[PDB]
Design a protein around this ligand. Structure first.
Ligand SMILES: Cc1cc(Nc2nc(C(=O)N3CCN[C@H](C)C3)nc3ccc(Cl)cc23)n[nH]1
Length: 293
């Protein structure tokens, strides 16, 4: 059947063999929409790595499994989690990656208020990554706080590229409904032709996460949230009167319904709000203590 075809094709783009020849003591530490995240130990090194496992049979869009392993192969950027190897183990794709020991931004957002120096530092890191990716024609398509990982010393890296897409001169736009509902851009929900700008909208929703503690419409059923994103004015900060005019002006350039008028990552790197961006040391306290909103 087509599963055997897809499996054979995937085997052609991953590394050969079974990584159980060198990885020990798998422990599940998390999960997302396509599979689970484990930690494992290198038998020779004592080195810790992260291993994502994705069952080919459980994917709504299995062809998307190719994209990450291929597009992000050998990708080296200071704000992108490094991928080391990938394997086909039975009916599962395993991707071996660098282990980020500060956890995900989501755990920060649910447990502590962030100040604007810290929000700006996160935005700056993500935009440095997106500026390079977008210039290369890569759309991430799952920007949200759970896709953002931290080191213990406060460095910020983008992960979870499993929904990513490649655009080009010949095919400059995608139309697939891909992402996580509450973060999806309205043109993407509408299945209109879209480009890298969808990531900028999603980043705007993540700024609302950092300020408010959750995205708009978060306890709404996801299909209803998507209709409200598609049809209503851009969502507002609950804590609108608590943020600076600079932060609001920045957000106003991200949450723009018309994708042609939404700011690009390269434009946003010039925005004065990002002059507030603190160094990694400013992020460290957020992983060690809690402060209520
Ligand atoms: C690829 C990778 C992940 C990672 N560290 C982590 N990933 C996940 C986890 O399971 N996630 C977070 C990202 N989004 C996934 C869908 C689910 N949870 C963690 C909890 C505590 C600490 Cl200390 C590190 C974590 N290092 N390298």
């Amino acid at each position: 059947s087509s599963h055997e075809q897809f499996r054979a094709a995937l085997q052609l783009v991953v590394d050969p063999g079974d990584p159980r020849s060198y990885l020990d003591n798998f422990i599940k530490i998390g999960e997302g929409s396509t599979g689970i995240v484990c930690i494992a130990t290198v038998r020779s090194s004592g080195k810790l790595v992260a291993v994502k496992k994705m069952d080919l049979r459980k994917q709504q869009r299995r062809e998307l499994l190719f994209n990450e392993v291929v597009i992000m192969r050998d990708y080296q950027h200071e704000n992108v989690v490094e991928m080391y190897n990938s394997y086909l183990v039975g009916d599962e794709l395993w991707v071996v990656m660098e282990f980020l020991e500060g956890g995900a931004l989501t755990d920060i957002v649910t447990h502590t208020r962030m100040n604007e120096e810290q929000i700006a530092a996160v935005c700056l890191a993500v935009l440095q990554a997106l500026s390079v990716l977008h210039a290369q024609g890569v759309i991430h398509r799952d920007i949200k706080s759970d896709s953002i990982l931290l080191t213990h010393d406060g460095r910020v890296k983008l992960s979870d590229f499993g929904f990513c897409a490649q655009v080009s001169k010949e095919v400059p736009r995608r139309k697939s409904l891909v992402g996580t509902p509450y973060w999806m851009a309205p043109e993407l929900i509408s299945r209109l032709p879209y480009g890298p700008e969808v990531d900028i909208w999603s980043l705007g929703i993540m700024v609302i996460e950092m300020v408010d503690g959750e995205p708009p419409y978060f306890n709404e059923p996801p299909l209803k949230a998507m209709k409200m994103i598609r049809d209503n004015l851009p969502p507002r900060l609950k804590n609108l009167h608590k943020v600076s005019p600079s932060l609001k002006g920045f957000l106003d350039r991200l949450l723009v319904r018309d994708p042609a008028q939404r700011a690009t990552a390269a434009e946003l790197l010039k925005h004065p709000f990002l002059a507030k961006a603190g160094p990694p040391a400013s992020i460290v306290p957020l992983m060690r203590q809690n402060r209520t909103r």
